[PDB]
């Protein structure tokens, strides 16, 4: 029963107005906000998840074993831990700006509809999780990077998160359970 799912339609995710706390919903793709939930959403699915999410500090709600799952996209970069991957197995050598600029790119290319992550990371994730469309599989607090660790648990499922920078390179994660 108990389920993560925000019964949304894809590129959907809940955000929580500045004052009087209450929720609305945004489109990441056309930056549409609406109060209204939008055509395709599970009414009933939503409902119940919204009722769990004001009485979850206002958090999104996490499994049965209190993880999260995403997928996403790394760019490494020469001032990042490890500095070599799969496509570049004698190093990385591009600058921290030069991998901002080129997953800015991406961002992008990914919330216009251009283009999946899954996709994209496939061929250009740094990650050895690029053969797995960029999936990392269910994790808890504490087992990720602070940063990633942010990121990801604030997101609800359906999600893309900005570009969020940790000690491994810069990333784009998308929240799939």
């Known amino acids: 029963m108990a389920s993560t799912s925000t019964g949304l339609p894809p590129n959907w995710t809940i955000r929580v107005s500045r004052?009087?706390?209450k929720?609305?919903?945004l489109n990441q793709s056309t930056n549409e906000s609406s109060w209204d939930p939008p055509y395709g959403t599970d009414k009933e699915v939503l409902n119940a998840y919204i009722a769990k999410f004001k009485n979850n500090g206002y958090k999104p709600l996490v499994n049965e074993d209190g993880q999260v799952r995403v997928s996403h996209l790394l760019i490494k970069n020469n001032q990042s831990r490890k500095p070599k991957s799969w496509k570049s197995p004698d190093g990385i050598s591009r600058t921290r700006d030069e991998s901002?600029?080129?997953l800015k790119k991406h961002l992008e290319r990914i919330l216009s509809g251009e283009v999946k992550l899954s996709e994209?990371?496939?061929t250009e994730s740094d990650c050895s999780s690029h053969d797995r469309g960029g999936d990392l599989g269910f994790f808890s607090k504490g087992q990720?990077?602070?940063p990633?660790?942010?990121a990801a648990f604030n997101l609800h499922v359906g999600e893309?998160?900005?570009i969020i920078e940790t000690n491994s390179g810069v990333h784009i994660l998308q929240r799939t359970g």
């Open 160 to 162: 893309v998160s900005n």
């Open 144 to 146: 990720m990077q602070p």
């Open 23 to 25: 929720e609305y919903f």
């Open 100 to 102: 901002i600029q080129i």
């Open 120 to 122: 994209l990371a496939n």
């Open 148 to 150: 990633f660790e942010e």
């Open 19 to 21: 004052s009087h706390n």
